[PDB]
């Protein structure tokens, strides 16, 4: 009982119109197999430009965030409806930068994901513990709590878990170059599988993709991709470089 | 010592690609005098589409929000650099929906504005009190506190106030249809002028535009626009309708 590999590239708050056009063009020009999901997430104002430049039949474009309300009086926010109207089907939710730096609570992330999922979108739901929480030996407690908030919102509607791609990114690995070792990563993904089996369904744990993120790059992704419970990567800085295409190849050849 | 009128249309989280194209086209097709600043603020993902559809030489496009950091690891956020790279020069900051519903603090709004201003952008800085604060007779205290946070960030760099357009929108008037009377609005703008004179400069208070927002529409904007300290309007719901063009005409003929 395995899985369709997944690699997402989160551009974060980076890029100019020319960078988006050129970089998306370079990615789209790369041979992308039909056996692996490849998604890139440019900043909101760059979405249209990225879509126009994406000449690939496999590459999909995603948003880095979405609000938990539909269209209405939510100045500065983006609705699921807007993303779907633009032809987008993927969206990142709960990235630790929003959780830890911008105050996005466990419940808000969960509500954003639920709304996106109910409308038919695929959600890259991020979870991860800080250096201090790990030092306090609370790694699994935290990751599970974040996943539980989502479980509370979906709960019964298990089927909605089908369009969820969990992205484990230890906060101490985000933008620090301090990537997790295959053992550290696999150990956490194992704990996440177990939680899914118990709180969701044994069958579902076998199908849901769980990707690793946090300093993942061309020279370290192969060893990570060889781990049974690591279905791919959520790439940050490296997704802005040509090595992102190499990571795609490595992921394909590995699983 | 007077001012160049200003009318901004905040679309908030509304619109589809077709709506943006058609609505922006209809606005752009309207005769816009060179004597009044007219700006519309579509949602972030619609910016490019709006720019493409804006065939007017006078109409300017603005963003509804911006982050307080430059390009970097800020997932889901937009930088000033991105907005300027797109040719945008206006941005709304501190809208009460973000302050009151999304937790944007007085200091965060102030820091966002300062960064935008330092880079050369024009900022529509929103302020406003809630029904309870007004009932508690704390209307001016609150509005002044929000303005003071900005004053703390700019403080000395007074000159930066040149590109600031203050938008007073009583929270109880936002999306409720309960517009402020000309007396209520003028009274607050008078108090804001006085604060500016004391904490900024007598000269500057004479030049800075202070616009009214909150249920402003085609049938009530004339009486508001006739008030000496009301230089224009920040239009919400009405900016999504053809009456927005009427408001432009009314503002022009009035001052």
Curated annotation (Swiss-Prot), chains A, B:
Query: Among its keywords, does the record have Mitochondrion?
Result: no
A GO molecular function annotation here is: triose-phosphate isomerase activity
Tell me the GO BP annotations in alphabetical order.
gluconeogenesis; glyceraldehyde-3-phosphate biosynthetic process; glycerol catabolic process; glycolytic process
Q: What is its main location?
A: cytoplasm
Q: Which family does it belong to?
A: Belongs to the triosephosphate isomerase family.
> Which residues participate directly in catalysis?
95, 169
Which reactions appear under catalytic activity for this entry? D-glyceraldehyde 3-phosphate = dihydroxyacetone phosphate; dihydroxyacetone phosphate = methylglyoxal + phosphate
User: What positions does the entry give for substrate binding?
Assistant: 10, 12
Q: Origin organism of this chain?
A: Giardia intestinalis
Which InterPro entries does the UniProt entry name for this protein?
Aldolase_TIM (IPR013785), TIM_sf (IPR035990), TrioseP_Isoase_bac/euk (IPR022896), Triosephosphate_isomerase (IPR000652), Triosephosphate_isomerase_AS (IPR020861)
GO cellular component annotations of the record: cytosol
Q: Which UniProt keywords apply?
A: Cytoplasm, Gluconeogenesis, Glycolysis, Isomerase, Lyase
Among HAMAP family, the record links this protein to:
TIM_B (MF_00147_B)
Describe the function of this protein: Triosephosphate isomerase is an extremely efficient metabolic enzyme that catalyzes the interconversion between dihydroxyacetone phosphate (DHAP) and D-glyceraldehyde-3-phosphate (G3P) in glycolysis and gluconeogenesis. It is also responsible for the non-negligible production of methylglyoxal a reactive cytotoxic side-product that modifies and can alter proteins, DNA and lipids.
State whether keyword Disulfide bond applies.
no
**What is the protein name given in its UniProt record?**
Triosephosphate isomerase
Its annotated compartments are:
Cytoplasm
Pathway note: Carbohydrate biosynthesis; gluconeogenesis; Carbohydrate degradation; glycolysis; D-glyceraldehyde 3-phosphate from glycerone phosphate: step 1/1
Subunit: Homodimer.
| PROSITE patterns with a match to the protein in the record | TIM_1, TIM_2
Q: What is its EC number?
A: 5.3.1.1, 4.2.3.3
On the tree of life, the source organism's domain of life is Eukaryota
SUPFAM superfamilies documented for this protein: Triosephosphate isomerase (TIM)
Q: Which Pfam families match?
A: TIM
Q: Which CDD domains match?
A: TIM
């Amino acid at each position: 009982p395995a899985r369709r590999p997944f690699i997402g590239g989160n551009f974060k708050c980076n890029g100019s119109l020319d960078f988006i056009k050129s970089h998306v063009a370079a990615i789209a020009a790369h041979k992308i197999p039909d056996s692996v999901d490849v998604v890139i997430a440019p900043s909101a104002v760059h979405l249209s430009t990225a879509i126009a430049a994406n000449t690939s039949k496999q590459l999909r474009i995603a948003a880095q965030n979405v609000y938990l309300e539909g269209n209405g009086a939510w100045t500065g926010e983006t609705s699921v409806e807007m993303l779907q109207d633009m032809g987008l089907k993927h969206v990142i939710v709960g990235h630790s930068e929003r959780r830890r730096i911008m105050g996005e609570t466990d419940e808000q992330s969960a509500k954003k994901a639920k709304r996106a999922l109910e409308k038919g979108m695929t959600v890259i739901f991020c979870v991860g513990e800080t250096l201090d929480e790990r030092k306090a030996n609370r790694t699994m407690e935290v990751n599970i709590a974040q996943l539980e908030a989502l479980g509370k919102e979906l709960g019964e509607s298990k089927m909605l878990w089908k369009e969820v791609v969990i992205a484990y990114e230890p906060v101490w690995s985000i933008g620090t170059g301090v990537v997790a070792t295959p053992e550290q990563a696999e150990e956490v993904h194992v704990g996440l599988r177990k939680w899914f089996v118990e709180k969701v369904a044994a069958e579902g744990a076998q199908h849901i993709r769980i990707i690793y993120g946090g300093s993942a790059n061309g020279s370290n992704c192969e060893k990570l991709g060889q781990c049974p419970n690591i279905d791919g990567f959520l790439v940050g800085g490296a997704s802005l470089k040509p090595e992102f295409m190499t990571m795609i190849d490595i992921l394909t050849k590995t699983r």
